[model samples]
Target: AAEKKAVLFVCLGNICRSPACEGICRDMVGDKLIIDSAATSGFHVGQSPDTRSQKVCKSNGVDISKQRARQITKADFSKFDVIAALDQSILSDINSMKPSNCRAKVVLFNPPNGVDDPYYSSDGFPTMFASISKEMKPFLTEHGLI
Candidate 1:
């Protein structure tokens, strides 16, 4: 059997940004792709998505309430086909951790400027979700996943 194309979304903490991206992308691609997310930092490791983020996602029909935060590891370089960073910082972090022989593609989730981290802004989750959804179509099309 052929291997599945796997995508890993990444952010600082994973509670808000990356989880949201994972949910949105999963909705778009369905079972054709394997999607997951992780955090660069371990602050919220093992914890479920943030309350505010879950609320925003639930309102949009994306259920991320069960998503948990996890720290990105070197093993992930081999586990997934693509590593999508939510922002530049996460991208840099993932890039720095990638092994010399790693073949996985590390990219920004939103192209030039990624979805802004929503943990800091009071109303950021909703806006971030919308922006991610907007970027998904082009991203999927460009990757030939659509």
Candidate 2:
């Protein structure tokens, strides 16, 4: 039997890159695994995903509009099998917040670089998410997740 994975994608604000990552994962794995996203800070907790983020996902036929922003909790460390960060700063933040007994393996994507926040960019998000999906597909496959 294939293992079930609970993956979390994280960023400074959940509404931008992380939620899009979550939505992309959902499309890749469906209900075969549990996937979610979070923020390093609670600046936008309880708020829906950013409008531009939703717009990009919507055009791709994925709806991430329902996703809410929330700060990563200690419990999240235990809950997820993997926690993926969009960039180095968020990765450092998660590492600091990680509990001693946490079991999840943390990872960073986009190589030595990471996914950029599309919030400030007016027209690049669709292209940005396309690149992210390309980057994530193989990672999930390697982890026996897809």
Candidate 3:
């Protein structure tokens, strides 16, 4: 039997890109894979996703508003099979936070580069949604979740 797989998507605040990506992956794989999102920092912990982030996801037929921001934890390294960072800076933070015996495969959400934050742009959420959908499928397939 195939082992159950888990993935954690991460960003700066957990109120934007990471949650949206988590929502997208959840819609794709459902309970087949354990999917979650987090922030490298605690800045927005306990808050729901940004309004624009929620709105764009809603239009894409994924509801991420129910997800609350959370900071990534040391236990996460062993809890998840994959830890995907949305940007380079967030990735750097995670590298510093992981335990020496960490088992998860750490990678950029869209490798070779990172996803741009939509929190600062007036019309960035829709574009963010598009980029995630485009990138997520291949990732799922690569991990044998699709």
Best by TM-score, which number? 2
lDDT of candidate 1 over 27-122, digit per residue (tens): 776545646677788886665437677677778856554666766667777887777777778888777767788767877876434466545565
Number of backbone collisions per candidate: 0, 0, 0
Per-candidate TM-scores read 0.82, 0.83, 0.83
The full ranking of all candidates by TM-score, starting with the best, is 2, 3, 1
The segments of candidate 2 whose C-alpha lies over 4 angstroms from its true place after superposition are 46-49, 112-114
lDDT scores for all predictions?
0.69, 0.69, 0.69
Model 3: per-residue Cα lDDT over 22-110, one tens digit each: 66766776645546677777886665437767776877756554666766677777877887777777788788767777578887777
In model 1, which runs have C-alpha deviations exceeding 4 angstroms?
1-4, 46-49, 111-114, 117-121
Candidate 1 total steric clashes: 0
2 or 3, greater by TM-score: 2
Cα lDDT over the full model 1: 0.69
Report the alpha-carbon TM-score of model 2 versus the true structure: 0.83
Root mean square deviation (Cα) for candidate 3: 2.5
